[PDB]
Amino acid sequence: DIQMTQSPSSLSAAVGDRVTITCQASQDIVNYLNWYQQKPGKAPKLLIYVASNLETGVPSRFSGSGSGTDFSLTISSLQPEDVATYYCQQYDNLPLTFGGGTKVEIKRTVAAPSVFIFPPSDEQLKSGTASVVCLLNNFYPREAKVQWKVDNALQSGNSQESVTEQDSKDSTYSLSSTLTLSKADYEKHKVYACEVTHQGLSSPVTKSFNRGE
Amino acid sequence: DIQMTQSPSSLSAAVGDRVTITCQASQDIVNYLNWYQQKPGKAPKLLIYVASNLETGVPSRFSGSGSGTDFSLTISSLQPEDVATYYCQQYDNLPLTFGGGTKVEIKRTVAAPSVFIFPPSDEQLKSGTASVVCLLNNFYPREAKVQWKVDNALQSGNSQESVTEQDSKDSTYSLSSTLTLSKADYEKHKVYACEVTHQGLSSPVTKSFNR
Amino acid sequence: QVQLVQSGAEVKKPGSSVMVSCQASGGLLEDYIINWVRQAPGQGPEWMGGIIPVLGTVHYGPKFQGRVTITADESTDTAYMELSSLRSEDTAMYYCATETALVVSETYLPHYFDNWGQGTLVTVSSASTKGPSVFPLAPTAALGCLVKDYFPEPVTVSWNSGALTSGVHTFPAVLQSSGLYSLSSVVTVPSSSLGTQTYICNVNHKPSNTKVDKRVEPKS
Amino acid sequence: VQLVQSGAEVKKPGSSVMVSCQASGGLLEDYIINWVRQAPGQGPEWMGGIIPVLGTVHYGPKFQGRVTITADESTDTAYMELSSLRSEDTAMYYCATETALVVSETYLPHYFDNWGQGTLVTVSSASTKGPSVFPLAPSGTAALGCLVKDYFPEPVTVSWNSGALTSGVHTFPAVLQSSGLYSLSSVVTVPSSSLGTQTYICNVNHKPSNTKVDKRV
Amino acid sequence: LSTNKAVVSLSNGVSVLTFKVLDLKNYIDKQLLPILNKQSCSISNIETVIEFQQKNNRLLEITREFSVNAGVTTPVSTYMLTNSELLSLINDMPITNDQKKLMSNNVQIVRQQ
Amino acid sequence: TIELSNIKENKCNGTDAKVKLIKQELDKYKNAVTELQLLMQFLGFLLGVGSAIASGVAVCKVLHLEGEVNKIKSALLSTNKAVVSLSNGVSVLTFKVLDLKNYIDKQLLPILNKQSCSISNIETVIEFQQKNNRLLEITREFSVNAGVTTPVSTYMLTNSELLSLINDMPITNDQKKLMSNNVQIVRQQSYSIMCIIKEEVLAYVVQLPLYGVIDTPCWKLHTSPLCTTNTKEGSNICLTRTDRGWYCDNAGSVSFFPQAETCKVQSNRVFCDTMNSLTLPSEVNLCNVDIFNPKYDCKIMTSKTDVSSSVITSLGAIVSCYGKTKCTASNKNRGIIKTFSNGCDYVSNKGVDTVSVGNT
Ligand SMILES: *[C@@H]1O[C@H](CO)[C@@H](O[C@@H]2O[C@H](CO)[C@@H](O[C@@H]3O[C@H](CO[C@H]4O[C@H](CO[C@H]5O[C@H](CO)[C@@H](O)[C@H](O)[C@@H]5O[C@H]5O[C@H](CO)[C@@H](O)[C@H](O)[C@@H]5O)[C@@H](O)[C@H](O[C@H]5O[C@H](CO)[C@@H](O)[C@H](O)[C@@H]5O[C@H]5O[C@H](CO)[C@@H](O)[C@H](O)[C@@H]5O)[C@@H]4O)[C@@H](O)[C@H](O[C@H]4O[C@H](CO)[C@@H](O)[C@H](O)[C@@H]4O[C@H]4O[C@H](CO)[C@@H](O)[C@H](O)[C@@H]4O[C@H]4O[C@H](CO)[C@@H](O)[C@H](O)[C@@H]4O)[C@@H]3O)[C@H](O)[C@H]2NC(C)=O)[C@H](O)[C@H]1NC(C)=O
Ligand SMILES: [Cl-]
């Protein structure tokens, strides 16, 4: 098989910046090369075919270049909706192969997260488990930390966090952390809190609730 | 050298008119001819190369034609931001030579000047000179007159005026006149006014102040 | 504007075989190269094979050859892909994707993919299919619902049957230690509308054929 | 690629001047580098050009023997020396390039498609002297400004709030005063409602004398 | 398959230099026919048709020569064997360096013979 | 001469459809220039042997002398046509037929360079292919003809250029008229000898025939075997005039061209080449009125081989019919109209369209 080596693995650039991705083949493939754009969870989209031809309806800020073994994809003025994974794909001989992908992230101004906490349902408690959710809503950058604190006891490793992909129109993230406990130990304590640290807040934000009301 | 004779030397046309500029060489230069646009105070910008090729990002309203010894530059729909001097330039053989240039001026409707007067600063007077500035702001046509009046006595020849080029976004002119005298002679009088006559105002506007 | 509509997502036990269908709406199969391209979690897409009905030719990748069969039933405009002897590596999103093939030579091979299906998420696992239970996350304000304990993926969620779109955030499912998936869907809402407007999150879990409409309200 | 030339300066009559031109972001091997000057009230005049990839230099017949054009490929700077200066030489000197990527052995300059900003060389016996800057305090729509008086040689530049105020500025051409020094005015029109809550500062730069003054008005 | 020049051993035992001088199959199969089908059987770039007319032109001119010569031509024209190909053939031939230099400085005579 | 430009640095990258065509077209021009530089690094048996291009080649050696190209190059600076006096003293017409240097240096490369090896106007690449095509075909002809061609093709010399050569040659108005109305023959009697690629100019010598004898009377002699008509198979005798060929009056003598296939007839004019001729006394014509005349010994060959044949003449057919061979003459409207008896007989082209001798 022909190996496609794509570089870089990920990159972050501001809106309007010029971005170039590289694709290299393990051998000469003339210019029998395609490019695809994949946003998270959706099918790939054909952007460039036969090394340089622009697919219909793709903005002219995209371009494809290269021949032989080295190829490039150039975005002349990056826009928020271009956040996606890019793949090159060769067809010089079978089997058809894709590159490793290049994840493109948008660098924007720092936005602080809005933090909300949700108590477990009375209905869920009856089934014997309790999920306590903490939410960070529409923030940037990606790096945030949520450590649960029961009364004042730091919780370790009893939570799972999930992050949305970068929003296509305003380049922000959202994150939910879920603290799962048994019904026996949930009704054993009183005040539940999730403490959140991030670059957009001057002091760390804590949202809590009392199991009484 | 090859001498390029450019015609006309200046022209005035209304916004939206079709304008043609001519360049003729003293000898055959095939189609080895370029056109440049120079706005006041800035370096020239290349518009056309090899007689007819449009530079990238130059409006499609520009076109070039000609061959041999006679060439032309055509603007299909003149716009305000095109106020500038244009030069043709040959390269058939060295030295490269330029034409004399054609200044393009925009004809528009009459706009009255905004007339403003400024007294000399307290900081400047201590240094021993007094400059009093009178301003005509955003007027048309080019021809304007500023006559100083100290108290009520008309002043002759102790001032200097400077006029800007046509503004690139609205095609109006501005003119400032500076009246320079010694501090001794400034404190000899009290109330200073500048009265301005122009085609955009029905009556002459006078702006004054008390020292 | 041919639309490629694939069969539903499903879970298959290890060692058996799966058939994915791909319905072409608006055209014939004779006019295309029909390819199958899969994508495993966290990996790039992978070309599995292609069929060229106008040439009567089938092509398979070396990694799959001998356990993939691609057929093109021209009487119903449906493409099929059988994948036998399933393994854990085969858990992937299987995409049907075509290339226009009007002027075709012999020795013509697949080159690109200009039209894609929506994808069929095949999970290879021994676990039984199980539908989710949906719990409220009771409450500018924020509310949502927690979709807990379902298998296999995927689950979808919409608010007010698609009426509420601006401001919803549905998180990727997280695998719990129990082996079942859970998921959250939140939406930010003006605090002034908590009493006059109703908020329903519509959960659809096709793998178990269960669709659940949960209404949330501020408890007591 | 940007071409950045040396600063304006005054030169005594009879001496020689060197203007530099920095090609930034690319090699000098890739260009024809021409020198084009423009005297006050005239068109441009081609002085010469250098084709570093060919090792070829060309000077206009009017200028050969008192112009030297060099291209220093170690710093990507082309230079233009002009000796035995006289009054006719007071002019704006432009560095201007043509891309010369596919070149023939007999390739010559043809056009100027990329320009530097220009270096205004004034030949005069007068000494360099910096200006004093005075506010034009105010007292529909209102106007204010500052007057830059008594400097030599030209040019002076001016920006308001470090370039923040652009809509409505008018910078007039300098007028030659009887003392032999130039003076110039810069005015800007602004809505009357911001006269009390917004601050307006003009930053005057006269590089020939190395004077930068930020005066608050 | 991988190179344009190879030495092949024939069935009777003689080894003969081989040379792929024009690959029109791959041009059509991978570069032209894919461009063509994608844009609804239309080509939006005049440069694409010319590139094909150029690739095809040599194959057409070869056909003209065999069609007028009944399949045996002399001298070997530049359409049958371009100058670079002939110099590569001589240079890769199993002959002396005195011979290679002779043939390479006199390719015009090598054609005529 | 064709004026070329040296291309030093072809630094164009970028796989763009429009870019690729100019880069590949430029390589064609460069390769053609380089390719051309590597190139420099009966009774017929009585006739003499000449050196057809010794005259043209000798002029070509003079062009290799020092400064000889600069004279040519400087004389053809302002016009495309100038008379140059060479170092040896010979005056030669010079002719700049194609100026690729100025096209590449002043029109193409600036357009090419401006948009970073990209050309936004397909018409500029084609105009170059048209300009370049002639140089490519000149090279193509010289590479398979080993630097000397005949006839002079329209690539070496266009029709209008050749007419201009003729009008400027130091020849008679009668001569110019003859050459001008028969350019197709003038080409066929011409050589084009490739010369030098020195300085920035390609030069080749075109060696044109000059016709110093025009409008003198000519005649073609056709001969055929004449045999006895005996009944015994081998008792026959044969006799043939061998002096067949073309004869033209020329400077008080008669030029004889034995191989009549080396002469070309256009209407009633015969173009022959004196290097393929013998110079004979005017009395050779007596062989036509009396083969036993005492003033010229007429040439014949003798044989015992009585085979049947036919010789098509200008206005008829000589038929040598012997043995049992069937010999007839036919009309298109009537079939066979004459059957020949044994012996040598003749038929005019008036009533006859074909002649059949045996299976021929
Ligand atoms: C095809 O073909 C063609 C023809 O041939 C071509 O074209 C071409 O190309 C080329 C490429 O190859 C190019 O070239 C060029 O070169 C040059 C060189 O130089 C040198 O040095 C350098 C430095 O520099 C400096 O110095 C100079 C003087 O000398 C000057 O002039 C400059 O400017 C500079 O300065 C500055 O900076 C600095 C920094 O450091 C500082 O210090 C100072 O002070 C100042 O500031 C160096 O670097 C180099 O070296 C290098 O290289 C080599 C090879 O290459 C290597 O080996 C080494 O090592 C090095 O590298 C390094 O680095 C890198 C980065 O860079 C990394 O990555 C690596 O790894 C390493 O580490 C030399 O030696 C130069 O200059 C240039 O550059 C440019 O470009 C690039 C790309 O291309 C980029 O990257 C950069 O950045 C630049 O760019 C720029 O510019 C532009 C204009 O327009 C812009 O836009 C951009 O953005 C930029 O900008 C920037 O910067 C500036 C300044 O500079 C500023 O102003 C701004 O703001 C920003 O920041 C280049 O490289 C040429 O040019 C061309 N030409 C044309 C005409 O085009 C092509 O390419 C082909 N193609 C294909 C595909 O093939
Ligand atoms: Cl040469």
Helix (H, G, I), strand (E, B) or coil at B142: coil
Report yes or no: F105 and F127 within 8 Å, Cβ to Cβ: no
Both tokens of D97, joined, read 């390039």
Report yes or no: C173 and C157 within 8 Å, Cβ to Cβ: no
Strands D9-11, D119-123: pairing is: parallel
> Omega of the bond prior to F294 within 30 degrees of 0, cis?
no
Pick from A53, A91, A94 the residue to mutate for testing the E interface (most E CBs within 10 Å): A53
Helix (H, G, I), strand (E, B) or coil at D45: strand
Both tokens of F286, joined, read 């007596």
Q: Is the dihedral of CA B44, B46, B52, B56 positive or negative?
A: negative
Resolution rounded to one decimal, in angstroms? 3.5
Breaks (C-N over 2.5 A) in chain A follow: none
For residues C75 and C54, give the distance between their C-alpha atoms in angstroms, rounded to a whole number: 14
Both tokens of A69, joined, read 């073994």
For residues B30 and E15, give the distance between their C-alpha atoms in angstroms, rounded to a whole number: 59
Both tokens of C178, joined, read 């129990």
Strands D91-99, D119-123: pairing is: antiparallel
Chains F and C touch (3+ CB pairs under 8 A): no
Convert B74-105 to b/e letters by CB count within 10 Å (16 or more is b). Answer: ebeebeeebbbbbbbbbbbebbbbbbbbbbbe
Both tokens of F123, joined, read 């018409």
Provide the strand spans (E) within C87-128.
Answer: 92-100, 115-116, 120-124
For residues E39 and E29, give the distance between their C-alpha atoms in angstroms, rounded to a whole number: 16
Provide the strand spans (E) within F245-359.
Answer: 245-250, 253-257, 264-266, 269-271, 278-280, 300-303, 309-312, 316-321, 327-331, 335-339, 343-348, 354-357
| Torsion angle defined by CA atoms of residues A26, A28, A29 and A30, in that order, rounded to the nearest 10 degrees | 150
Contact D96 B120 (CB under 8 A): no
Ligand 1 atom nearest to CA at D23: 31
Largest CA distance in chain E: 58
Q: Provide the terminal-to-terminal Cα distance of chain E, rounded to the nearest Å.
A: 31
Q: Provide the terminal-to-terminal Cα distance of chain A, rounded to the nearest Å.
A: 63
- How many domains does the structure of chain C reveal? 2
Both tokens of F287, joined, read 């062989």
Name the residue with tokens 């690139």.
B168
Is residue C164 domain-shared with residue C206, that is, in the same domain? yes
Q: How far is the CA of F196 from the centre of ligand 2 (A)?
A: 10
For residues A54 and F28, give the distance between their C-alpha atoms in angstroms, rounded to a whole number: 29
Report yes or no: A33 and A23 within 8 Å, Cβ to Cβ: yes
Is residue D5 domain-shared with residue D110, that is, in the same domain? yes
Is residue C143 domain-shared with residue C180, that is, in the same domain? yes
Helix (H, G, I), strand (E, B) or coil at B192: strand
For residues C133 and C127, give the distance between their C-alpha atoms in angstroms, rounded to a whole number: 17
Q: How far is the CA of F69 from the centre of ligand 2 (A)?
A: 12
Q: In D, which residues are within 8 Å of F113 by CB distance?
A: 98-102
Helix (H, G, I), strand (E, B) or coil at B161: strand
For residues D98 and D104, give the distance between their C-alpha atoms in angstroms, rounded to a whole number: 14
Residue with CA closest to ligand 1 atom 84? D25
Which of C109, C126, C143 is at the close of a domain?
C126
Region at A12 (left for phi over 0; alpha for psi -120 to 50; beta for the rest): beta
For residues B57 and F10, give the distance between their C-alpha atoms in angstroms, rounded to a whole number: 27
Contact F111 B53 (CB under 8 A): yes
Any F CB within 8 A of A63 CB: no
**Residues paired with A101 in a beta bridge:** none
Helices (H) and strands (E) in chain C, counts: 0, 19
Q: What angle do CA B30, B32, B34 make, to 5 degrees?
A: 140
Name the residue with tokens 């090159």.
A88
Is residue D114 domain-shared with residue D131, that is, in the same domain? no
Q: Which of D1, D24, D53 to mutate to test the pocket of ligand 1 (most atoms within 8 A of CB)?
A: D24
For residues C45 and D102, give the distance between their C-alpha atoms in angstroms, rounded to a whole number: 42
Q: Amino acid identity, residue F76? A: L
Name the residue with tokens 């083969």.
F291
Q: Is the dihedral of CA D72, D73, D75, D77 positive or negative?
A: positive
Q: Provide the terminal-to-terminal Cα distance of chain C, rounded to the nearest Å.
A: 52
Strands D77-82, D17-24: pairing is: antiparallel
For residues C191 and F349, give the distance between their C-alpha atoms in angstroms, rounded to a whole number: 119
Domains in chain B with CATH codes: 1-107 (2.60.40.10), 108-211 (2.60.40.10)
Closest by alpha carbon to E3, among E17, E15, E13? E17
Name the residue with tokens 């011979």.
E99
Report yes or no: B185 and B122 within 8 Å, Cβ to Cβ: no
What is the residue range of D139's domain? 126-217
Is residue C121 domain-shared with residue C161, that is, in the same domain? no
Closest by alpha carbon to F255, among F241, F240, F276, F286? F276
Is residue D137 domain-shared with residue D60, that is, in the same domain? no
Is residue C63 domain-shared with residue C135, that is, in the same domain? no
Both tokens of E113, joined, read 């013979």
Is residue D40 domain-shared with residue D115, that is, in the same domain? yes
Any F CB within 8 A of B32 CB: yes
Strands B10-14, B102-107: pairing is: parallel
For residues D14 and C215, give the distance between their C-alpha atoms in angstroms, rounded to a whole number: 92
Contact A66 F17 (CB under 8 A): no
> Omega of the bond prior to C190 within 30 degrees of 0, cis?
no
Q: What are phi and psi of E23, to 5 degrees?
A: -110, 85
Non-local (6+) Cβ contacts of B199 within 8 A are B110, B141, B143
Name the closest residue on chain C to residue A123, using Cα atoms.
Answer: C135
Both tokens of A93, joined, read 């001989």
Non-local (6+) Cβ contacts of E48 within 8 A are E32, E35, F17
For residues A158 and F13, give the distance between their C-alpha atoms in angstroms, rounded to a whole number: 57
For residues F357 and F360, give the distance between their C-alpha atoms in angstroms, rounded to a whole number: 5
Contact A30 E26 (CB under 8 A): yes
Report yes or no: F150 and F190 within 8 Å, Cβ to Cβ: yes
Closest by alpha carbon to F39, among F156, F153, F138, F142? F142
For residues C133 and C214, give the distance between their C-alpha atoms in angstroms, rounded to a whole number: 10
Question: What is the number of other CB atoms lying within 10 angstroms of the CB of residue B8?
Answer: 11
Non-local (6+) Cβ contacts of F47 within 8 A are F258, F276, F277, F278
Which of D93, D125, D157 is at the close of a domain?
D125
CA atoms within 13 A of residue F323's CA, in its CB half-sphere: 12
* Whole-number Cα distances in Å, A75 to A170, B206, F64: 19, 58, 57
For residues F236 and F306, give the distance between their C-alpha atoms in angstroms, rounded to a whole number: 7
Report yes or no: A101 and A87 within 8 Å, Cβ to Cβ: yes
* Whole-number Cα distances in Å, A148 to A202, A210, C144: 20, 14, 20
Q: Is the dihedral of CA A96, A100, A106, A111 positive or negative?
A: positive
For residues C34 and C99, give the distance between their C-alpha atoms in angstroms, rounded to a whole number: 7
For residues A19 and F65, give the distance between their C-alpha atoms in angstroms, rounded to a whole number: 60
Report yes or no: D125 and D13 within 8 Å, Cβ to Cβ: yes
For residues F93 and F84, give the distance between their C-alpha atoms in angstroms, rounded to a whole number: 6
Q: Which DSSP category does F103 fall into?
A: I
Is residue D120 domain-shared with residue D210, that is, in the same domain? no
Which of C79, C97, C126 is at the close of a domain?
C126
Name the residue with tokens 């046309």.
B13
CA atoms within 13 A of residue D31's CA, in its CB half-sphere: 31
Both tokens of B25, joined, read 């060489």
Both tokens of A162, joined, read 């999930």
Non-local (6+) Cβ contacts of F345 within 8 A are F318, F319, F321
Closest by alpha carbon to B159, among B192, B187, B200, B115? B192
Residue with CA closest to ligand 1 atom 123? F13
* Whole-number Cα distances in Å, F14 to A31, A49, A92, A99, D30: 11, 16, 19, 21, 17
Name the closest residue on chain F to residue E112, using Cα atoms.
Answer: F144
Is residue D107 domain-shared with residue D169, that is, in the same domain? no
CATH at residue C100: 2.60.40.10
Q: Amino acid identity, residue F164? A: S
Name the closest residue on chain D to residue F108, using Cα atoms.
Answer: D102
Q: Measured from the CB, is residue D4 less than 6 Å from ligand 1?
A: no
Pick from F16, F22, F33, F38 the residue to mutate for testing the E interface (most E CBs within 10 Å): F38
Helix (H, G, I), strand (E, B) or coil at D211: strand
Q: Amino acid identity, residue E50? A: I
Is residue D157 domain-shared with residue D190, that is, in the same domain? yes
Q: Is the dihedral of CA A37, A38, A39, A42 positive or negative?
A: positive
Residue with CA closest to ligand 1 atom 117? D26
Both tokens of F201, joined, read 């100019």
For residues F138 and D141, give the distance between their C-alpha atoms in angstroms, rounded to a whole number: 77
For residues D40 and D27, give the distance between their C-alpha atoms in angstroms, rounded to a whole number: 32
Closest by alpha carbon to D147, among D119, D179, D178, D175? D175
Convert E27-64 to b/e letters by CB count within 10 Å (16 or more is b). Answer: bbbbbbbbbbbbbeeeeeeebbebbbeebeebeeebee
Is residue D22 domain-shared with residue D91, that is, in the same domain? yes
Any A CB within 8 A of C59 CB: yes
Q: How far is the CA of D31 from the centre of ligand 1 (A)?
A: 15
Question: What is the number of other CB atoms lying within 10 angstroms of the CB of residue B131?
Answer: 23
- SS3 letters across chain A: CCCEEEECCEEEEECCCCEEEEEEECCCCCCCEEEEEECCCCCEEEEEECCCEECCCCCCCEEEEEECCEEEEEECCCCHHHCCEEEEEECCCCCCEECCCEEEEEECCCECCEEEEECCCHHHHHHCEEEEEEEEEEEECCCCEEEEEECCEECCCCEEEEECCCCCCCCCEEEEEEEEEEHHHHCCCCEEEEEEECCCCCCCEEEEEECCC
Non-local (6+) Cβ contacts of B32 within 8 A are B50, B51, B90, B91, B92, D110, F106, F107
